[PDB]
Design an enzyme around this catalytic site. Sequence first.
Site, mmCIF file in Angstrom:
data_model
loop_
_atom_site.group_PDB
_atom_site.id
_atom_site.type_symbol
_atom_site.label_atom_id
_atom_site.label_comp_id
_atom_site.label_asym_id
_atom_site.label_seq_id
_atom_site.Cartn_x
_atom_site.Cartn_y
_atom_site.Cartn_z
ATOM 1 N N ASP A 181 5.875 -23.427 5.814
ATOM 2 C CA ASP A 181 5.221 -24.373 6.715
ATOM 3 C C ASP A 181 3.810 -23.889 7.013
ATOM 4 O OD1 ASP A 181 4.511 -26.138 8.612
ATOM 5 O OD2 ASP A 181 6.112 -25.657 9.989
ATOM 6 N N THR A 182 2.814 -24.463 6.352
ATOM 7 C CA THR A 182 1.430 -24.021 6.557
ATOM 8 C C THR A 182 0.939 -24.425 7.961
ATOM 9 O OG1 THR A 182 0.579 -25.989 5.416
ATOM 10 C CG2 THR A 182 0.742 -23.981 4.110
ATOM 11 N N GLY A 183 1.605 -25.398 8.582
ATOM 12 C CA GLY A 183 1.339 -25.807 9.966
ATOM 13 C C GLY A 183 2.014 -24.992 11.127
#
Lengths: 99, 99
Positions: B25-27
Amino acid sequence: PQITLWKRPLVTIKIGGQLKEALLDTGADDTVLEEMNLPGRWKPKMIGGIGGFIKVRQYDQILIEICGHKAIGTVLVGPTPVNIIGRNLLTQIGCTLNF
Amino acid sequence: PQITLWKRPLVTIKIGGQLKEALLDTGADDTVLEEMNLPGRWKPKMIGGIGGFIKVRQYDQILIEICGHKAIGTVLVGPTPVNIIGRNLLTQIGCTLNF
Ligand SMILES: Cc1ccc(N)c(N)c1
Ligand SMILES: Cc1ccc(N)c(N)c1
């Protein structure tokens, strides 16, 4: 480009004539932007995440430039605290995770 | 590997002797896992996202394998609906976004 993850992957976007910054979010199915007027027809939608669910407006076939890469598709607008570029648009610009 | 985003980027992880699946999850600033017992010392933490904020337990220097890539670091455990691998660990395994 190739983006590393030491900081949040916030990039420049252009939508409806305005410049914004937005997070490239591999954990978002959908694209979600802070409040803003956008052309014409919408249909309500709910999205959830950590902490709960929010109501958003769904807009279809919206043009959005993501670091120079143009994509057309669904954009949601609602009370998110960060503009989020989700997988709907990440696929269009050819975005992959690599390690 | 190189992961594309047509589906959610759910991969196999191993933590505290158990096999799980987790979203790259880059967020997510942080790594957050569904409820599970883990060794010893924790200190409370709050995390927010879409919809609100949740209370989690923070554990430091936790070993976690992410698709065969080992990393040690901070893992949070709490009422998330999906196991999330955040940037704290993504940096360790050398993970980048490319388009
Ligand atoms: C500017 C614009 C607004 C809504 C839609 N649905 C489309 N295609 C274009
Ligand atoms: C197994 C384990 C639990 C907690 C900590 N803090 C560490 N380092 C290792």
